[PDB]
Amino acid sequence: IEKPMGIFSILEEECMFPKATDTSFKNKLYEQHLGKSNNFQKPKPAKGKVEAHFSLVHYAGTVDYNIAGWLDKNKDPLNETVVGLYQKSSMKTLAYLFSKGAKKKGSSFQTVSALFRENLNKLMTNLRSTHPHFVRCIIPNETKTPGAMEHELVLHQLRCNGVLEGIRICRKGFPSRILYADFKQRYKVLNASKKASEKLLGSIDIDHTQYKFGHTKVFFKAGLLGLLEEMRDD
Amino acid sequence: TTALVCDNGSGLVKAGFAGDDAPRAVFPSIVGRPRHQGVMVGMGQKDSYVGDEAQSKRGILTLKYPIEHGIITNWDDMEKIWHHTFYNELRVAPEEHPTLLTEAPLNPKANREKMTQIMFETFNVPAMYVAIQAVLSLYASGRTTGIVLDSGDGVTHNVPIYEGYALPHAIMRLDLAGRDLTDYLMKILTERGYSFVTTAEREIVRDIKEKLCYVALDFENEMATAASSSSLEKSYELPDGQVITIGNERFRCPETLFQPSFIGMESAGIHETTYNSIMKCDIDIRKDLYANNVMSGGTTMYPGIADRMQKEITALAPSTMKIKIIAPPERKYSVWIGGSILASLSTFQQMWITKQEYDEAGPSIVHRKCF
Amino acid sequence: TTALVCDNGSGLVKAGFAGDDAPRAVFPSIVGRPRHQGVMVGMGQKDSYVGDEAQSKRGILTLKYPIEHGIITNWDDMEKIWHHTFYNELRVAPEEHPTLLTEAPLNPKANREKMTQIMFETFNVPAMYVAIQAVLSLYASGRTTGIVLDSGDGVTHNVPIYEGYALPHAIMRLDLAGRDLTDYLMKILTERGYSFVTTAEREIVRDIKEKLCYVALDFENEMATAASSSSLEKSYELPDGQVITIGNERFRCPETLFQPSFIGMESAGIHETTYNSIMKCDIDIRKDLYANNVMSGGTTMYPGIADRMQKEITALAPSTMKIKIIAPPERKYSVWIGGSILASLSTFQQMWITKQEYDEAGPSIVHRKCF
Ligand SMILES: Nc1ncnc2c1ncn2[C@@H]1O[C@H](COP(=O)(O)OP(=O)(O)O)[C@@H](O)[C@H]1O
Numbered sequence: 023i024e025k026p027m028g029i030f031s032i033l034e035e036e037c038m039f040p041k042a043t044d045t046s047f048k049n050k051l052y053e054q055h056l057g058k059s060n061n062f063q064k065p066k067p068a069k070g071k072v073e074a075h076f077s078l079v080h081y082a083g084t085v086d087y088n089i090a091g092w093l094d095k096n097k098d099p100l101n102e103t104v105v106g107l108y109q110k111s112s113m114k115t116l117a118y119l120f121s122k123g124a125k126k127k128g129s130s131f132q133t134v135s136a137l138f139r140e141n142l143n144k145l146m147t148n149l150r151s152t153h154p155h156f157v158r159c160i161i162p163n164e165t166k167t168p169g170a171m172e173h174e175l176v177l178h179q180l181r182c183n184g185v186l187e188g189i190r191i192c193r194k195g196f197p198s199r200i201l202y203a204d205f206k207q208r209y210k211v212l213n214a215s216k217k218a219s220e221k222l223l224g225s226i227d228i229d230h231t232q233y234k235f236g237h238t239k240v241f242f243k244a245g246l247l248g249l250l251e252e253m254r255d256d
Numbered sequence: 257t258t259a260l261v262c263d264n265g266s267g268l269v270k271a272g273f274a275g276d277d278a279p280r281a282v283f284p285s286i287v288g289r290p291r292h293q294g295v296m297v298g299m300g301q302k303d304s305y306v307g308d309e310a311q312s313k314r315g316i317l318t319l320k321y322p323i324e325h326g327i328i329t330n331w332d333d334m335e336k337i338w339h340h341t342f343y344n345e346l347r348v349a350p351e352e353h354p355t356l357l358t359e360a361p362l363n364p365k366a367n368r369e370k371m372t373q374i375m376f377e378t379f380n381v382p383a384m385y386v387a388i389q390a391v392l393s394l395y396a397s398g399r400t401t402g403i404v405l406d407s408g409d410g411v412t413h414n415v416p417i418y419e420g421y422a423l424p425h426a427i428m429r430l431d432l433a434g435r436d437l438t439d440y441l442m443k444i445l446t447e448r449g450y451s452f453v454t455t456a457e458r459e460i461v462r463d464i465k466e467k468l469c470y471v472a473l474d475f476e477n478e479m480a481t482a483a484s485s486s487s488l489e490k491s492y493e494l495p496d497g498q499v500i501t502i503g504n505e506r507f508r509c510p511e512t513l514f515q516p517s518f519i520g521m522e523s524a525g526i527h528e529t530t531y532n533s534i535m536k537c538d539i540d541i542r543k544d545l546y547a548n549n550v551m552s553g554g555t556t557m558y559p560g561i562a563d564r565m566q567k568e569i570t571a572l573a574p575s576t577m578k579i580k581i582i583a584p585p586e587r588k589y590s591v592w593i594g595g596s597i598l599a600s601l602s603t604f605q606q607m608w609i610t611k612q613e614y615d616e617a618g619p620s621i622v623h624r625k626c627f
Numbered sequence: 628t629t630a631l632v633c634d635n636g637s638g639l640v641k642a643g644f645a646g647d648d649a650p651r652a653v654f655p656s657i658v659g660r661p662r663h664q665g666v667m668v669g670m671g672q673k674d675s676y677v678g679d680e681a682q683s684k685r686g687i688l689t690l691k692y693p694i695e696h697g698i699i700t701n702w703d704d705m706e707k708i709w710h711h712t713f714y715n716e717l718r719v720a721p722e723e724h725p726t727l728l729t730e731a732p733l734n735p736k737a738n739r740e741k742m743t744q745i746m747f748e749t750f751n752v753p754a755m756y757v758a759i760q761a762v763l764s765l766y767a768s769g770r771t772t773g774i775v776l777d778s779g780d781g782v783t784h785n786v787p788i789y790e791g792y793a794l795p796h797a798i799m800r801l802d803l804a805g806r807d808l809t810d811y812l813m814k815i816l817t818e819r820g821y822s823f824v825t826t827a828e829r830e831i832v833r834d835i836k837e838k839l840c841y842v843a844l845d846f847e848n849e850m851a852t853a854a855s856s857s858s859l860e861k862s863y864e865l866p867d868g869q870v871i872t873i874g875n876e877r878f879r880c881p882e883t884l885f886q887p888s889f890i891g892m893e894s895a896g897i898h899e900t901t902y903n904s905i906m907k908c909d910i911d912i913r914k915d916l917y918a919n920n921v922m923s924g925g926t927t928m929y930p931g932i933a934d935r936m937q938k939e940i941t942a943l944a945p946s947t948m949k950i951k952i953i954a955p956p957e958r959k960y961s962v963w964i965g966g967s968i969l970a971s972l973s974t975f976q977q978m979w980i981t982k983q984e985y986d987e988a989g990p991s992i993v994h995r996k997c998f
């Protein structure tokens with residue numbers, strides 16, 4: 023979306039080109055990306071929806087976009103003599119419009135996506151200069167009946183918040199970092215500290231691939247304690 | 257990073273940054289050298305001015321355009337021009353800026369080659385490219401079809417383009433342009449008693465031409481009119497007073513473009529070569545070309561040229577074809593504008609000629625599709 | 628589910644859905660490719676237009692009919708034609724649609740073989756079938772007996788049918804059709820001074836033929852008349868003005884169909900081949916055939932062709948049989964109409980070639996009575 027020859031760049035090109043049209047934009051997009059990438063892909067005609075034109079995949083699943091109107095919605099050539107008029111007006115409008123050559127575009131090359139990608143990076147840097155924390159206020163139910171919830175709707179809030187992506191990235195590694203406090207007392211039922219952990223692990227039939235006790239806690243994939251859950255009880 | 261767009265032409269160098277809206281720096285592409293000896297020691301007179309500085313020092317210099325008809329004849333003065341452009345007009349190290357160069361069609365290949373070579377050796381740019389002035393002029397007009405009639409100061413060419421395809425066999429170059437009109441005006445201004453012979457006062461004559469001249473919708477009627485009345489005379493003050501007056505000349509001079517016989521050339525007039533270039537194209541695309549006569553370059557900036565042009569080419573063409581003439585009000589810079597537009601593209605960022613590539617393949621690379 | 632009816636033919640692809648009343652999509656079966664180089668970057672010019680797109684871009688392309696005389700010679704362009712038809716003209720996934728294809732009689736066996744193979748591999752249809760254009764054109768006419776004289780753009784054939792039985796030993800195919808008439812008109816238009824040589828302007832000539840030409844009831848009388856008077860001259864405006872006028876040519880051109888010697892062919896005329904095809908059939912069925920001459924194909928759409936045809940074949944036949952000529956006003960689409968009719972049937976829904984069957988028996992299944 024952001025690199026050169028990306029979607030935004032191509033949209034800018036078509037906002038510059040003499041006689042560009044929505045069909046030319048769609049073509050240029052396809053010929054520049056289709057097949058030559060994986061995220062970008064063709065829309066699927068189904069579901070009675072009017073028109074999709076290209077499908078992207080994000081951390082929150084796939085989504086296909088409609089292209090009609092993107093050209094004349096993005097071009098915004100800011101006039102200059104009228105801005106001078108504003109600067110010289112007698113109201114307080116001039117308070118807004120108060121008055122290098124490299125990387126500055128012309129008053130005829132202006133485009134919305136550019137200002138977006140500019141202030142977006144302004145954020146993504148000044149926010150990158152600050153320690154983060156996160157809160158995800160869900161709405162679990164259509165109406166105001168507390169305690170009761172439906173999954174599909176909170177499933178949507180799951181992806182829009184993408185916390186499932188966090189649990190996935192922490193999910194393909196060692197999610198379970200646990201001490202001996204419960205490990206010894208729950209696993210001594212098969213072979214009735216560190217060397218005691220080695221004894222209690224070699225004896226309950228686990229291979230040395232899907233776990234690791236580094237020096238303080240033992241690290242575990244998720245699906246292995248369930249294997250023990252039913253077996254570490256007898 | 258930013259790309260540079262230097263449109264040389266004759267008469268006027270115009271440069272700027274890709275993506276801008278107008279060339280930042282514009283100055284006459286001349287090199288002057290003193291022709292007296294100078295007597296004030298400590299004045300530290302330099303040995304060769306250039307650009308507006310020479311244009312101001314005219315009185316004691318001898319000016320020499322290093323581009324004659326689209327082609328470069330004195331390479332050292334051209335290098336001085338480029339160096340002055342980069343280091344004073346734009347004040348930018350050309351080390352990290354792909355530059356876009358322009359040239360007329362049907363030029364000596366050695367011109368373009370030596371241009372590339374100097375660009376890569378002397379100034380050591382990261383990349384470069386040479387484009388055809390007419391294509392850029394079409395870009396600037398937001399078209400994609402239509403013959404374009406560029407007419408700068410040294411050359412005049414028609415390029416018919418359709419759907420972005422150029423028909424090269426129908427390109428018509430003609431070596432009649434602003435410099436020739438200036439000379440013819442210098443000539444016919446004698447018959448009133450005014451004598452301008454110095455390379456300096458050729459500039460005076462050029463100013464007179466840019467201010468007073470204009471194309472006449474009907475040559476014979478205007479001639480008879482200027483004969484009868486005197487409502488056409490206009491005065492003009494020279495750099496030392498002594499106002500002068502020109503009458504018939506005002507439209508005699510630019511009339512040449514339609515009757516080149518005035519200066520002894522045999523080729524056909526502007527309208528005629530335009531119509532011929534049309535007729536050489538395939539029959540299925542002639543209506544659009546009739547409808548989209550773009551016009552650029554400073555010589556197409558005469559009051560009335562578009563109307564006379566339309567009348568003539570209408571007289572030549574059939575009657576059921578619509579004749580239109582796209583003459584924007586800023587057309588003098590259409591080449592540079594289109595150049596900035598093109599250079600600012602991203603689908604263009606893979607057409608440049610990389611320094612490494614040129615080192616690999618030598619200046620013969622230009623003619624290759626690294627065009 | 629719905630079935631497709633794609634009548635390829637030369638010159639004109641006409642497709643649509645079974646059961647409809649007229650083909651939805653109709654466009655020239657040509658594939659154009661640019662022949663200049665193109666200079667405006669970012670135009671994203673595709674490399675091969677097709678159909679009406681190419682017919683509009685004619686001025687800068689080189690058009691190639693991929694079907695010479697009923698037979699497919701360039702399979703890649705034919706595949707482009709089919710793909711464009713399905714995915715843009717009808718906008719339908721061919722995955723779930725049995726398609727009906729047509730071809731002339733006495734064609735190369737490999738033609739229909741490779742056709743079936745491509746239809747099953749590339750497009751992966753569920754089923755398909757290949758029918759004889761003349762049988763369909765008879766279906767559309769609501770007949771069950773009568774010689775059908777289909778004369779498309781590439782080929783011309785007679786098929787005598789009686790009670791729904793075909794007499795293959797009397798099928799007479801002749802390789803003179805609209806394309807040859809177009810070429811002959813291009814030739815004889817020179818003798819007036821008009822010169823069309825480009826594949827683009829062959830289309831202009833085709834339009835002239837479709838508009839102005841007509842068949843003369845008596846060739847000699849019309850020749851002498853055009854000599855004497857000028858009441859036959861008609862004008863025509865080319866795509867760039869410069870109106871032209873044609874006289875004698877208007878009926879000189881389509882007269883070829885009755886005197887193939889004009890283009891240096893040795894075979895007999897249309898009327899005579901028809902009469903011969905009649906005479907090759909059994910004597911008991913000749914009267915019905917005399918009464919039921921059917922005409923299809925765009926080439927049989929000349930003003931006056933039915934009257935001249937009747938006169939000639941009456942002169943050849945005895946004076947006690949009755950000669951009639953069934954020339955509907957929409958006969959140009961009779962093949963597609965008959966195809967839709969036949970595909971709509973249910974007694975036909977077991978004649979298709981199921982993809983499973985082809986996978987089981989290979990493309991040789993076509994000639995096999997799974998026809
Ligand atoms: N207003 C004007 N009227 C007539 N001629 C003009 C006018 N302005 C400029 N010119 C002529 O046009 C020339 C400049 O054209 P230009 O497009 O700069 O040429 P080039 O493309 O070779 O640089 C000047 O030499 C001048 O003689």
Ligand SMILES: Nc1ncnc2c1ncn2[C@@H]1O[C@H](COP(=O)(O)OP(=O)(O)O)[C@@H](O)[C@H]1O
Nearest residue numbers: 636637638639779780781805837924925926928
């Ligand atoms: N009105 C007309 N008058 C004369 N000829 C015509 C007319 N319309 C079409 N044709 C000719 O008939 C041809 C189209 O016939 P068609 O039945 O489409 O052939 P095919 O069956 O091979 O596609 C065109 O090539 C054209 O030259």
